[PDB]
Amino acid sequence: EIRPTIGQQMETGDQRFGDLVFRQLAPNVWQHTSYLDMPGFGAVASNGLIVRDGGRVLVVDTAWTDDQTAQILNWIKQEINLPVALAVVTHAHQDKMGGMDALHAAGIATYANALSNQLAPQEGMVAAQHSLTFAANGWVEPATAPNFGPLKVFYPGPGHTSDNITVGIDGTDIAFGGCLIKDSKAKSLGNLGDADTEHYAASARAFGAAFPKASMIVMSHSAPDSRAAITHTARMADKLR
Amino acid sequence: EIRPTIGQQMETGDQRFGDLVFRQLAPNVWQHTSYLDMPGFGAVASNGLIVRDGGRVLVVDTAWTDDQTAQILNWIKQEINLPVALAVVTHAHQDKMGGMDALHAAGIATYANALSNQLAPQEGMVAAQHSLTFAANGWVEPATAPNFGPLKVFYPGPGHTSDNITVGIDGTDIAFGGCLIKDSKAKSLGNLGDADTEHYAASARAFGAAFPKASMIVMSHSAPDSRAAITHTARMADKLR
Ligand SMILES: C[C@@H]1CS[C@H]([C@H](NC(=O)[C@H]([NH3+])c2ccccc2)C(=O)O)N=C1C(=O)O
Ligand SMILES: C[C@@H]1CS[C@H]([C@H](NC(=O)[C@H]([NH3+])c2ccccc2)C(=O)O)N=C1C(=O)O
Ligand SMILES: [Zn+2]
Ligand SMILES: [Zn+2]
Ligand SMILES: [Zn+2]
Ligand SMILES: [Zn+2]
């Protein structure tokens, strides 16, 4: 078993595949988990989503590396047996965008907040091929997100980073908060180095308000949690201002 | 204000002093907190203890670095102004033993598990001046812990590492679990790279049985917790075996 220093542990039903772990969250939704070995600290898990929509698949976030991301695509091709229509990445850091080149090499169209694409090169990340823009209330502008099917993209405001976005899965009770949301029992908000400490709490609550019925909250570095992940995250953030 | 990626956040009553934070836990006990800043990840907090016993100060664990540990010694001189009679470190890892040269520069007698001193070179730590040895029941051999006063040293068995030790403070309701014990809301056992997965659970419970009077459990990367820390640590460790 892989036992990360940060991240959920193996559970019955989890599928180990090379260095990756996949957990089915719904008939048409899987969490992909990849691991970064921090010397002297141990492994750090990062979680993203794989969504089946009819005859195709949609991906949220890359793995930490290109190699790991290639393995995710292999898994999709081999266990799900459907083509990836597109990927959305939720901000310009390694755990969410470190595997962009593997997507592009595989000929997959990629999308990110325009601001994520603007920051990407400053973060040593490859930008997505397309830019998402957002309305004043945070919802993605449809014209910039063609054929996203059930991926419902929402920009909650600056929080973990200025550019972080979130994704609800339509036709399910799942919403993905990426690195913005921490688990309901977290003692910290993780890396606040690029954080907007003034607006974090409002952006966390905005996410909750955007996906009001979502009962299963998926996040980057813990196992799927209740809505208490959103409200605890917001409480922790309240103590920043 | 320091907001660590890993570790408890600052609270009312905390004292900021240089790059460190100090927090009084009892009339004669303080917790020291130092931070290791990791590029692209943020700071990791590590906690140790400062004990005033009669007419001297006893230190448990160094800070991450020499410079940080020298700052602890300067805080002690300022706030308490009694000699530091000795320091004990709770195993041979950077967060617990990284600042040993600072203690030696200041002429302070240092103590560690013999095994910790033996491991120190491989771990890139400086070995303490003196080696503690233990009885088969885990209690320190008193002849190797001269002048420890209220510091009751217990080797609980292997867990976080082969060499981890723990310390109870006689006359207080405080015991120190170091990196062995995680808080009652912890999602993982932290870094398991050196851990004894078979024996961790029993070692955690042996710690609790060694210090039944300890109402306040102090640990390396969380704020002080109730005894539920011990229970919860043990039950997490149960899942490794
Ligand atoms: C602290 C965690 C894991 S670090 C990750 C992200 N950092 C990174 O992706 C960064 N390349 C990194 C550097 C060294 C070790 C691990 C990761 C960030 O800064 O937001 N986000 C985090 C988060 O809080 O969601
Ligand atoms: C995972 C945490 C923080 S890492 C710390 C200890 N590691 C260290 O002290 C190590 N020099 C280190 C490297 C990089 C970042 C932070 C620390 C260990 O391996 O046990 N113990 C830990 C613990 O579980 O108590
Ligand atoms: Zn990030
Ligand atoms: Zn992250
Ligand atoms: Zn350690
Ligand atoms: Zn530690």
Curated annotation (Swiss-Prot), chains A, B:
Residues that span the membrane, as ranges: none
Record's keyword annotation contains Cell membrane: no
InterPro entries assigned: Metallo-B-lactamas, NDM-1-like, RibonucZ/Hydroxyglut_hydro
EC top class, as a word: hydrolase
Cofactor: Zn(2+)
Positions with a binding annotation for Zn(2+) 2: D95, C179, H221
Residue positions binding Zn(2+) 1: H91, H93, H160
GO CC, any one term: periplasmic space
Comment on bound cofactor: Binds 2 Zn(2+) ions per subunit.
Recorded catalytic activity of this chain's protein: a beta-lactam + H2O = a substituted beta-amino acid
Keywords: Antibiotic resistance, Hydrolase, Metal-binding, Periplasm, Plasmid, Signal, Zinc
One GO MF term: beta-lactamase activity
Domain of life: Bacteria
Pfam families: Lactamase_B
Main location group: periplasm
List of residues binding substrate: K182, N191
GO term, biological process aspect, one: antibiotic catabolic process
Family: Belongs to the metallo-beta-lactamase superfamily. Class-B beta-lactamase family.
Function: Confers resistance to the different beta-lactams antibiotics (penicillin, cephalosporin and carbapenem) via the hydrolysis of the beta-lactam ring. Does not confer resistance to the polymixin colistin or the fluoroquinolone ciprofloxacin.
Protein name: Metallo-beta-lactamase type 2
Originating species: Klebsiella pneumoniae
Taxonomic path: Bacteria, Pseudomonadati, Pseudomonadota, Gammaproteobacteria, Enterobacterales
Gene: blaNDM-1
